[PDB]
Amino acid sequence: YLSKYAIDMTEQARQGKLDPVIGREEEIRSTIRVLARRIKSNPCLIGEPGIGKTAIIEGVAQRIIDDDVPTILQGAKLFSLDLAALTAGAKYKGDFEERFKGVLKEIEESKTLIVLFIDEIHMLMGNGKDDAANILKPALSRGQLKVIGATTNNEYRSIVEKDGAFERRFQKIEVAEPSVRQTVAILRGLQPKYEIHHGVRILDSALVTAAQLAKRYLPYRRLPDSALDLVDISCAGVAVARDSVDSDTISETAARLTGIPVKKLSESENEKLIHMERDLSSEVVGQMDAIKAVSNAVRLSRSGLANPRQPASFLFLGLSGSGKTELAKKVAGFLFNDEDMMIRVDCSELSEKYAVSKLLGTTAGYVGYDEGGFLTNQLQYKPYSVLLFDEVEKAHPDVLTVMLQMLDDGRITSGQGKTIDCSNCIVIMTSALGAEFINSQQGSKIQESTKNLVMGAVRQHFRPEFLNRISSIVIFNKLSRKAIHKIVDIRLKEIEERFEQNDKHYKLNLTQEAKDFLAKYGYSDDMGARPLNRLIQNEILNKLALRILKNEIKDKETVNVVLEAEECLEVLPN
Amino acid sequence: ALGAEFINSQQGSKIQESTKNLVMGAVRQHFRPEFLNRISSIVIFNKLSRKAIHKIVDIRLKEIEERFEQNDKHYKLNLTQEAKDFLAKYGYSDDMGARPLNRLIQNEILNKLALRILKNEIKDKETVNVVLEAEECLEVLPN
Amino acid sequence: ALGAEFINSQQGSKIQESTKNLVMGAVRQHFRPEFLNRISSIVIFNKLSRKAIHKIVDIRLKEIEERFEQNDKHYKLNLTQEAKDFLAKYGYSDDMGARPLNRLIQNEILNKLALRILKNEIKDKETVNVVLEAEECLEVLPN
Ligand SMILES: Nc1ncnc2c1ncn2[C@@H]1O[C@H](COP(=O)(O)OP(=O)(O)OP(O)(O)=S)[C@@H](O)[C@H]1O
Numbered sequence: 040y041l042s043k044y045a046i047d048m049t050e051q052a053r054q055g056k057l058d059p060v061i062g063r064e065e066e067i068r069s070t071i072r073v074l075a076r077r078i079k080s081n082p083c084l085i086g087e088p089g090i091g092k093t094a095i096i097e098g099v100a101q102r103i104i105d106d107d108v109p110t111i112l113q114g115a116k117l118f119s120l121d122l123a124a125l126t127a128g129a130k131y132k133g134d135f136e137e138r139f140k141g142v143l144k145e146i147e148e149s150k151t152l153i154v155l156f157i158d159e160i161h162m163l164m165g166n167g168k169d170d171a172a173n174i175l176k177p178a179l180s181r182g183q184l185k186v187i188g189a190t191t192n193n194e195y196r197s198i199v200e201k202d203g204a205f206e207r208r209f210q211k212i213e214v215a216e217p218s219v220r221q222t223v224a225i226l227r228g229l230q231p232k233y234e235i236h237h238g239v240r241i242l243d244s245a246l247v248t249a250a251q252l253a254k255r256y257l258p259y260r261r262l263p264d265s266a267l268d269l270v271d272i273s274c275a276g277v278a279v280a281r282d283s284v285d286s287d288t289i290s291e292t293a294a295r296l297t298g299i300p301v302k303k304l305s306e307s308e309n310e311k312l313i314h315m316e317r318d319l320s321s322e323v324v325g326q327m328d329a330i331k332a333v334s335n336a337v338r339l340s341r342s343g344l345a346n347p348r349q350p351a352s353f354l355f356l357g358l359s360g361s362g363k364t365e366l367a368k369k370v371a372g373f374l375f376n377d378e379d380m381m382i383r384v385d386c387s388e389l390s391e392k393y394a395v396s397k398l399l400g401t402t403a404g405y406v407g408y409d410e411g412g413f414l415t416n417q418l419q420y421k422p423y424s425v426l427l428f429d430e431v432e433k434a435h436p437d438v439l440t441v442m443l444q445m446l447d448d449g450r451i452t453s454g455q456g457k458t459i460d461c462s463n464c465i466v467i468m469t470s471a472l473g474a475e476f477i478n479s480q481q482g483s484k485i486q487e488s489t490k491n492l493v494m495g496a497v498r499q500h501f502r503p504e505f506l507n508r509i510s511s512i513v514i515f516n517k518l519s520r521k522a523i524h525k526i527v528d529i530r531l532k533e534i535e536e537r538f539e540q541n542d543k544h545y546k547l548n549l550t551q552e553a554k555d556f557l558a559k560y561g562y563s564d565d566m567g568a569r570p571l572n573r574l575i576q577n578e579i580l581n582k583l584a585l586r587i588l589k590n591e592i593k594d595k596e597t598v599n600v601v602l603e604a605e606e607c608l609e610v611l612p613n
Numbered sequence: 614a615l616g617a618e619f620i621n622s623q624q625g626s627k628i629q630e631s632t633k634n635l636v637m638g639a640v641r642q643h644f645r646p647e648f649l650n651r652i653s654s655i656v657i658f659n660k661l662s663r664k665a666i667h668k669i670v671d672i673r674l675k676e677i678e679e680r681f682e683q684n685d686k687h688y689k690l691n692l693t694q695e696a697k698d699f700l701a702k703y704g705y706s707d708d709m710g711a712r713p714l715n716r717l718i719q720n721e722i723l724n725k726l727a728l729r730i731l732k733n734e735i736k737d738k739e740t741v742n743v744v745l746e747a748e749e750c751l752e753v754l755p756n
Numbered sequence: 757a758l759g760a761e762f763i764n765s766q767q768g769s770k771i772q773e774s775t776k777n778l779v780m781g782a783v784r785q786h787f788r789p790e791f792l793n794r795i796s797s798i799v800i801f802n803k804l805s806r807k808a809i810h811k812i813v814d815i816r817l818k819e820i821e822e823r824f825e826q827n828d829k830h831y832k833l834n835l836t837q838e839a840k841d842f843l844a845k846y847g848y849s850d851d852m853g854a855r856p857l858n859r860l861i862q863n864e865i866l867n868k869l870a871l872r873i874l875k876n877e878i879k880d881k882e883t884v885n886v887v888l889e890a891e892e893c894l895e896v897l898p899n
């Protein structure tokens with residue numbers, strides 16, 4: 040067997056239709072340290088899939104065919120003849136190894152000094168630890184020549200990396216995530232031929248952009264692949280458009296994944312974090328301090344002093360006035376524009392300081408399921424979520440402490456091991472029980488004595504590391520009387536859009552006197568604070584239904600109409 | 614080699630005591646007792662040594678001496694202690710066998726020959742000049 | 757033979773009805789009684805001490821080469837007592853014993869021999885004589 044599943048290349052390097060992309064040369068030089076390397080003749084290279092681990096090996100050939108490098112190994116076999124020949128040898132069983140053995144003689148004793156390479160070590164050895172690919176490999180490898188595979192790390196690879204045939208054999212030397220600046224030098228070097236065969240012409244600055252931005256925000260698809268897409272994405276519009284710019288190639292992409300790039304293309308970071316801050320003021324008023332308290336490590340977030348792995352967040356004081364938990368996540372969204380952030384864990388099951396039920400729960404060693412599948416998964420999902428807490432934590436101090444780990448420091452104690460990060464994750468434990476002392480309010484604001492003390496009563500309540508680090512504060516005077524009121528127009532403008540504003544432009548009117556009557560009643564002293572939404576909607580939504588029933592009128596309206604006496608009964612006519 | 618991993622753990626290049634019997638243990642696998650009576654004996658391929666092989670390797674040229682050049686022109690082969698040692702500690706195997714370096718040994722030969730067929734002064738008596746990827750070497754010839 | 761033959765006894769060929777019993781269940785564990793009832797006879801193997809193996813010697817001495825085409829080398833060997841013992845030293849491996857042991861006892865003694873053939877002084881004659889690592893005894897008798 041000769042050329043069939045093989046990658047005949049060095050020629051395609053020697054004739055050179057290959058397009059050089061020159062990455063990190065070191066591990067190659069490291070790899071070059073193979074040529075006569077013996078004891079363990081080779082390392083490996085472990086990336087995630089998309090990184091050109093072999094494009095390296097391709098670039099290696101560029102390091103090779105171009106010669107003027109060590110000719111200690113000079114004559115060449117680089118070519119990977121596996122493919123699927125594993126099962127794809129013939130019409131029946133047993134020839135897989137033949138399929139390589141049919142390779143063996145047409146690969147017989149080496150004139151050409153160059154070891155070749157097959158893909159993964161798990162493309163190597165077929166399934167792994169199977170006869171496929173001549174499971175035992177001194178005799179050729181210590182023998183005519185060698186080969187190389189490569190993959191991503193641990194488990195499947197680790198198993199055969201412990202002993203098997205690699206007991207004597209290769210290490211792994213792993214290029215990084217494609218780094219910062221070169222990536223345009225990459226990209227711009229990618230430019231000329233790739234961009235020359237892509238379309239039109241081009242200029243720098245945009246090239247910088249998604250580079251940053253794929254690097255940004257884009258752990259999945261971190262690789263230029265998207266730019267490489269953006270590349271084709273680029274010509275996509277215009278070359279078409281010309282058949283009959285601004286990084287706005289990136290825009291619709293950044294529209295695609297973000298939902299608008301004006302979300303992604305957007306407040307840059309830091310001033311704009313502060314602009315974010317003032318836009319969160321724009322969001323919700325109430326204690327500016329609360330805002331400002333929340334504003335604190337905003338700047339410290341992502342900027343770092345000791346680590347970004349610092350958790351930066353604004354420890355919550357459990358209560359719900361307006362933005363409260365909600366906007367706290369909304370801002371947390373309004374950080375990343377992503378509302379979704381993190382869920383809540385019911386701490387009910389968490390009652391003790393231990394259970395099989397924990398945010399980790401199981402270790403994944405033995406039968407069961409993952410408890411707290413969130414950060415199990417939520418990071419598998421997503422970086423930089425909100426968090427989840429309770430005014431009485433019924434949670435296990437275990438994890439709380441195991442998160443006091445992640446609490447004080449940044450990296451969290453991954454139960455299964457893999458603090459994939461704490462980078463942008465900045466969130467604040469939400470607890471307070473002092474409601475009856477929280478009940479201490481007069482006027483629009485509270486002077487602090489109580490707020491020291493139940494604080495104190497809590498300050499020592501659950502032990503200090505909790506209450507030790509992580510400054511910022513959350514304060515509740517609630518709404519005094521009106522100020523919340525503006526929420527209505529929100530509440531209003533929560534309406535029309537949700538489906539289509541088109542449905543009803545009718546936009547009505549709120550007759551503050553009602554909104555008073557609405558609010559004054561409608562939401563408790565304590566809270567009672569949701570329903571008027573859930574409510575006033577209705578009797579109105581009746582008219583909605585109603586005026587949608589027999590249907591004489593269509594307009595954009597202003598309602599502003601109202602009369603136990605507890606009901607003056609708003610309504611609205613045609 | 615079913616037993617050889619007993620000396621994988623470096624054990625008894627000279628076996629004594631019960632190792633052979635522990636060695637004889639894995640025997641029973643492939644074996645059967647009818648097979649027993651009809652079996653003469655049991656004999657190793659040993660672990661050798663440079664103490665052995667450092668001389669053995671020598672033979673390997675006296676081995677290969679007249680291969681290519683039949684009667685044409687012989688050589689001299691000054692080596693001394695480096696060009697005694699070098700290529701042995703270069704290419705021997707403590708795991709594969711006598712196998713590996715042989716083919717290697719073939720290599721450096723013809724390379725110098727490649728040199729010397731590139732050259733052809735180097736008429737009959739030939740000595741060897743060797744000094745210190747891996748395996749830093751020199752291994753040259755005057756001419 | 758599967759059973760408390762495992763213990764055998766530690767006593768002697770009598771062992772005991774115990775083991776003899778121990779087997780019966782150990783028989784009747786898995787097996788089929790009327791089929792077991794198909795057994796005509798209860799037979800067993802015992803502990804043979806010296807005298808047996810002592811004789812097994814006496815047996816083997818002649819015993820092997822006997823049939824051989826030309827024993828015309830007229831092989832008497834010897835004992836006194838001594839010669840019996842040297843293997844009877846090792847004479848019985850509790851596990852394996854003679855048939856394995858003799859197999860080499862066969863060999864080694866036999867191994868000793870084409871020597872005297874090669875020792876090219878005695879040709880057609882025999883006696884054995886020996887004296888005693890602890891090895892030497894081992895045949896080799898001059899003309
Ligand atoms: N300068 C460079 N040096 C080395 N490789 C590069 C360079 N620029 C781009 N590449 C890689 O070249 C690859 C060509 O496509 P493929 O290698 O098939 O995809 P790949 O997944 O990157 O390769 P793997 O999986 O890492 S071996 C791209 O995926 C890039 O990751």
Ligand SMILES: Nc1ncnc2c1ncn2[C@@H]1O[C@H](COP(=O)(O)OP(=O)(O)OP(O)(O)=S)[C@@H](O)[C@H]1O
Pocket residue numbers: 323358359360361362363364365366523526566567568569
């Ligand atoms: N402007 C606002 N005024 C009052 N409540 C608001 C406002 N914006 C959001 N919310 C509330 O944000 C809540 C989510 O955060 P939480 O702090 O858990 O509230 P809560 O603890 O359920 O008690 P509430 O919200 O005061 S009834 C929702 O229940 C909404 O009532």
